[PDB]
Nucleic acid binder design. Structure first.
Length: 594
RNA sequence: AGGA
């Protein structure tokens, strides 16, 4: 469609790659939007600027390997850390396939609404989610919040870690003269740097001023001098200043430095362009640009964020650059990624990583020893017909399980401008392997959703108003983070999933399961258009028919199991193709009714 | 139409 073009002939003409993309809304061909194995994010979210920032922290080896590395152990208390881990892990699994951050965003909204770090952190993030139109100096405001929320939660995981402080930690001592000849210092470990209205090129002078500056402003005119004597592994900058000075950045050739050298000699910090021109003491490190997030002012005068990314190749010692839109993913050259001459380009969040540490490969969770203990026990929140797991039933790379989920609606379409909200409510998984414990369920759990729902859909989902955890119908009610882990482990071990319309369930549980692990009875029993109903298909291929009233997931998952078993029968003997049309004639002439 |  001539959209992956990321360049043009005029500086004012924005390439089609940086344009607004249409909503996903339903099968959507994504093959003309990304030809690489690096996935994109579904833009059908409430707060849209967060998608660009998650992609930035994806391609840091230290940032990625830790958040994914926290998935071996069960940490449900830390919501934003594990939901980002699920998101980071699933995006690497997709290998180009579409991904959604809806589960990560539902955890960020619930954590923010719990305000009943300063409160100004959470209060600002709440207003932007409910109303995308990029505001002034808002994306970096979320950057400081995200890292600070990760640092706080990182110290609360099991076998508590400080790995994120050993990578983002900026030991900044803030000295202030309270009176004549009386110094007062504060030692605060900040996760990211901020750019102010610096006075009088290149980017290095702006970084040096942010690490050693002298200001005069207080509640009298008390001068304050804050400096940092630490060089962390990844250096996250929150660049924000005036437009009149932003226009001067456009004219400065090669303003964004790709690689640079710098260390501390005196109480200040100095950064040099080449390894020869630097001076001072013995040791000095090298920093390379790992990526940055820039805003695009459209020609229709609208705004959105993109993410530039550099990733190392261990085979060939070179750097492959990438530009990440919502789902528009392109491989670009380094000359085009560092170009700031375009007036619509405005860099907002720039990060630098250690040169020797950027070359570190990305390690998945598969390399660690994962703990699958949640599958064998219960984790009911409130104290108040199935059989749970035994250690003999060890799920293998080919274990059959029948899955069916049901969920309620939260919001409406809200057109004008896309349908937005539908959160998981109930999910039940069945044993698929033949034997004594065959066709019986092992996990039948509810979510703990407390948000104001709009419609329960009692006729289709078949749940009662009992999702308020302690109030109504405490029947194996459990959280949403815990049950996801149960589903995530089965996909991790390689269990094959059977059911009806399984692609739709995974879209709202927000987990991507590969093709060779899904056995969808809807696709197996598909003949062109007019997908068949599960209750109608059971009443014409088998004998069970409970009038299809107030659907239950334990039933829909059990009939979908034997419907699969009936498929292998009609497939072992050369029957299925003949019966595949036999049901059609009985359906076309009966209007698909019981 | 399935899918809730």
């Amino acid at each position: 469609s001539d959209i992956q073009t990321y360049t043009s002939i005029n500086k004012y003409e924005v390439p089609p790659a940086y344009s607004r993309l249409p909503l996903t809304s339903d099968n959507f061909d994504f093959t003309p939007f990304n030809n690489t194995e690096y996935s994109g994010l579904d833009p059908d979210v409430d707060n849209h600027y967060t998608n660009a920032i998650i992609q930035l922290y994806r391609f840091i080896p230290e940032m990625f390997n830790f958040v994914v590395g926290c998935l071996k152990d069960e940490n449900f208390e830390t919501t934003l850390l594990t939901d980002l881990g699920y998101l980071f892990d699933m995006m690497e699994r997709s290998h180009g396939k579409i991904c959604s951050s809806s589960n990560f965003q539902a955890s960020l909204k619930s954590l923010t609404d719990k305000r009943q770090e300063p409160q100004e952190h959470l209060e600002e993030y709440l207003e932007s989610l409910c109303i995308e139109s990029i505001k002034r100096n808002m994306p970096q405001k979320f950057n400081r919040f995200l890292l600070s929320q990760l640092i706080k939660e990182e110290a609360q995981t099991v076998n508590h870690n400080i790995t994120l402080n050993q990578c983002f930690g900026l030991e900044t001592e803030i000295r202030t003269e309270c009176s004549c000849d009386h110094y007062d210092t504060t030692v605060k470990l900040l996760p990211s740097l901020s750019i102010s209205g610096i006075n009088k090129q290149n980017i290095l002078p702006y970084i040096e001023y942010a690490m050693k500056n002298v200001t005069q402003k207080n509640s009298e005119t008390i001068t304050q001098e804050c400096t940092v004597k630490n060089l962390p592994s990844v250096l996250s900058l929150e660049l924000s200043l005036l437009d009149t000075e932003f226009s001067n950045i456009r004219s400065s050739k090669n303003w964004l430095t790709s690689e640079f050298y710098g260390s501390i000699i005196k109480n200040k910090a100095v950064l040099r362009s080449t390894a020869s021109e630097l001076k001072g003491t013995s040791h000095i490190f090298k920093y390379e640009l790992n990526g940055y997030v820039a805003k695009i002012t459209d020609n229709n005068n609208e705004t959105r964020l993109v993410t530039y990314v550099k990733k190392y190749n261990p085979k060939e010692n070179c750097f492959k650059w990438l530009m990440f839109n919502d789902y528009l993913v392109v491989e670009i050259t380094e000359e085009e990624a560092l170009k700031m001459t375009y007036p619509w380009k405005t860099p907002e969040i720039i990060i630098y990583c250690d040169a020797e540490e950027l070359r570190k490969p990305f390690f998945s969770v598969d390399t660690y020893s994962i703990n699958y203990d949640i599958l064998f026990r219960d984790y009911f929140a409130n104290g108040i017909e199935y059989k749970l797991l035994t250690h003999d039933e060890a799920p293998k790379s080919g274990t059959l399980v029948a899955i069916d989920a049901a969920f309620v609606s939260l919001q409406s379409e809200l057109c004008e401008i896309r349908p937005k909200r539908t959160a998981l409510a109930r999910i039940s998984i069945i044993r698929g392997e033949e034997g004594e414990l065959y066709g019986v369920p092992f996990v039948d759990d509810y979510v703990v959703n407390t948000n104001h729902i709009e419609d329960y859909l009692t006729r289709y989902s078949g749940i009662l108003p009992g999702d308020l955890d302690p109030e109504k119908s405490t029947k194996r009610l459990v959280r949403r983070n815990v049950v996801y882990r149960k589903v995530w482990l089965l996909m991790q071990l390689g269990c094959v999933f059977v059911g009806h319309g399984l692609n739709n369930d995974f879209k709202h549980i927000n987990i991507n399961v590969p093709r060779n692990q899904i056995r969808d009875t809807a696709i197996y029993f598909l003949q062109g258009k007019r997908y068949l109903s599960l209750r109608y298909l059971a009443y014409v291929l088998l004998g069970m028919n409970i009038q299809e009233g107030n659907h239950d997931s334990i039933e829909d998952a059990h009939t979908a199991l034997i419907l699969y078993k009936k498929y292998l029968h009609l497939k072992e003997k050369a029957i299925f193709e003949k019966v595949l049309n036999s049901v059609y004639e009985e359906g076309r002439a009966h209007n698909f009714k019981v």
